[PDB]
Design a protein around this ligand. Structure first.
Ligand SMILES: Cc1cc(C)cc(Nc2nccc(-c3c(-c4ccc(C(F)(F)F)cc4)ncn3C3CCN(CCN(C)C)CC3)n2)c1
Length: 125
């Protein structure tokens, strides 16, 4: 079975809007979402449908851009570093589960290169 997706709304978690979090949603997430290679990363890994019975035996901290989108739009994050961490967790999950040079890994690496280019332009708080 698939696990439930990560929490994206918490009424007990304090909320904040910052110029950096706005940039992460309106620039970073939007740009990665529209990339030709984004489609495997736009939702939780459906290990049942994809026939990956071991995915959630290996990946105990799942993450994906659909979850990141919801977290951003819900003001789930207090600081930009939490969101940057979620992107990095997503990429690392892909690398852990697969092998260097795999198609999906080349796709993730291209997305990560673009992500890092956009983070280098993160505005000061
Ligand atoms: C290239 C390609 C080819 C095909 C046919 C379909 C897809 N679609 C797709 N959709 C969602 C996840 C993945 C995916 C991820 C993966 C891991 C972590 C994340 C992250 F980052 F979100 F966490 C994101 C993604 N890892 C491997 N796959 C593939 C590898 C190839 N298999 C083929 C069948 N296999 C049983 C042998 C299917 C799963 N692939 C992609």
């Amino acid at each position: 079975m698939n696990p439930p997706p990560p929490e994206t709304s918490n009424p007990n978690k304090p909320k904040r809007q910052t110029n950096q979090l706005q940039y992460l949603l309106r620039v970073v997430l939007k740009t990665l979402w529209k990339h030709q290679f984004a489609w495997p990363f736009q939702q939780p890994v459906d290990a049942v449908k994809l026939n990956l019975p071991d995915y959630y035996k290996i990946i105990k901290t799942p993450m994906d851009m659909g979850t990141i989108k919801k977290r951003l739009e819900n003001n789930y994050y207090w600081n930009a570093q939490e969101c940057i961490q979620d992107f990095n967790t997503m990429f690392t999950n892909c690398y852990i589960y697969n092998k260097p040079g795999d198609d999906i890994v080349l796709m993730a690496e291209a997305l990560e290169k673009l992500f890092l280019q956009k983070i280098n332009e993160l505005p000061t708080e």
